[PDB]
């Protein structure tokens, strides 16, 4: 199936620990994380235990130091695999206001930069009608990460967000 790989130095160097389920805890075997090995799948990473603090979305792949996932230090302790719909397609639709008002965007297209091309810098409700997407922080998929995996998201709480900036959107394929 799907697998993670944690490894406390950079470059795949030092003490491992790996998974193939979500793991709400792994501090106990590992105090940091410097490089990740994704096999099979995406996962979700994230800084505290139960999923919590910052997440960082990684598809399959090598990531040989922290900053090869975005991440902002090396402190790493829960992870989820990001399971998608067999054969399932993308579409959000993304309002202005909150409790699903004001004015909306539906859309299927990744977007680099919602000023660009909603001309808007914030987001205060959402509805992902099909597939997984993560919403970012800033433009060009930086800043901090959100996972939104298909329904509703009546204010920016809900997925995760101390706030409404948004700047950045894509989906997470296969």
């Known amino acids: ?18 998974c193939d389920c979500d793991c709400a805890d792994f501090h106990t075997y590992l105090s940091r994380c410097n490089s990740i090995k994704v096999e099979g799948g995406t996962w979700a990473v994230y800084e505290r235990p139960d999923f919590a603090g910052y997440m960082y979305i990684l598809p399959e792949g090598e990531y040989p130091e ?14 989820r695999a990001v399971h998608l719909p067999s054969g399932g397609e993308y579409k959000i639709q ?7 008002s004001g004015q909306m965007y539906e859309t299927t297209e990744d977007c680099p930069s919602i000023m660009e091309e909603f001309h808007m810098r914030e987001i205060h409700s959402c509805k992902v009608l099909e597939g997984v997407w993560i919403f970012y922080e800033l433009p060009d998929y930086r800043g901090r990460q959100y996972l939104l995996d ?25």
Do not use: H
């Not at 922290?66 to 992870?79: E, I, K, V």
């Not at 993304?94 to 699903?100: L, M, N, R, V």
């Not at 509703?152 to 296969?174: L, M, T």
């Open 1 to 18: 199936g799907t697998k993670i790989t944690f490894y406390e130095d950079k470059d795949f160097e030092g003490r491992r620990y790996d």
């Open 150 to 174: 298909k329904k509703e998201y009546r204010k920016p709480i809900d997925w995760g967000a101390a706030s409404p900036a948004v700047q950045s959107f894509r989906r997470i394929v296969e």
């Open 66 to 79: 922290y900053q090869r996932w975005m991440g902002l230090n090396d402190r790493l302790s829960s992870c």
């Open 94 to 100: 993304i309002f202005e206001k909150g409790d699903f």
